[PDB]
Amino acid sequence: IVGGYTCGANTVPYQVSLNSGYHFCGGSLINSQWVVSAAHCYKSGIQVRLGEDNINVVEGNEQFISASKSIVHPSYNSNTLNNDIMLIKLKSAASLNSRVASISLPTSCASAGTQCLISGWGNTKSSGTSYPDVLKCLKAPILSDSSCKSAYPGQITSNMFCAGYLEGGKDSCQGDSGGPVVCSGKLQGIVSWGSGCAQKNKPGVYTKVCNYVSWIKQTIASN
Ligand SMILES: [Ca+2]
Predict the structure, then answer these.
(1) Annotation marks residue 84 as catalytic
(2) Is 53 a catalytic residue?
(3) Distance 161 CA to ligand 1 centre (A)
């Protein structure tokens, strides 16, 4: 997250870190057994880390649970990032508590102009590289479809939305991928892509989670 703030330990209790020997992507806990992340975060051999603040210090509220299964969306296209969503099943259910908690899936799609909370352990620099150890947060508004398509002509599908600031300076970034965009208390987006981070006229692009609720629900009813 570039231009964000330190969230505060365990104030984003649905945020997970996906670990394959190192943090590589975020995700969102949607119930005690399942995480939503980005399909482009797929790796074999994923451990889900819940209850994290500093991902490099065991502070005492973590749960580390291996994935048993990952399910990339059936229509994921890694070239365009259309349908950039994945489900990860935990080997064992998380113990839900004040620090480890699920986020609701949406009923309705979020509205342009809504300010959402985006969070992660990704890079904090637009030019260059610095990865934080503690979780960072950003409030960013959803942009209109027309503005999103202007920013990325021929690239935006109906399964994506933009959020952020066209002046630059505030955005998600590498290593935030797969993490949550929460709007009105529901998971509305997944950190997916963008041109660089926090560059002028190049806002973040997010997987539109409200288009996937029926897939998510049928898949978790079946696995
Ligand atoms: Ca930790």
Answers:
(1) yes
(2) no
(3) 31
Same-domain check for residues 89 and 55: yes
59 alpha carbon – ligand 1 mean position (Å)? 5
User: Among residues 106, 123, 111, 132, which one has the least CA distance to residue 174?
Assistant: 123
Same domain for 55 and 116, yes or no, is no
Domain that holds residue 58: 13-102+211-222
Query: Which of 40, 53, 102, 192 is labelled catalytic?
Result: 40
Tally of structural domains, the chain: 2
Task: Output the CA 58–ligand 1 centroid distance in Å.
Answer: 4
108 and 97 assigned to the same domain: no
| The one-letter amino acid at 75 | S
Please give the DSSP secondary-structure letter assigned to residue 106.
P
Residues 93 and 189 grouped into a single domain: no
Backbone angles phi, psi at 145, to 5 degrees: -55, -45
Is 177 annotated as catalytic?
A: yes
Q: Mark whether 8 and 112 lie in a shared domain.
A: yes
171 is known to lie in a ligand binding site = yes
Active-site residue, from 70, 84, 119, 176 = 84
**149 vs 39, 157, 170, 177, 200, CA distance in Å?**
22, 9, 19, 21, 15
- 110 and 3 in a single domain? The answer is yes
Residue 176: which of 164, 184, 186, 166 has the closest Cα?
164
Phi, psi of 181, rounded to the nearest 5 degrees: -120, 110
Calpha distance 151→154 (Å, rounded): 10
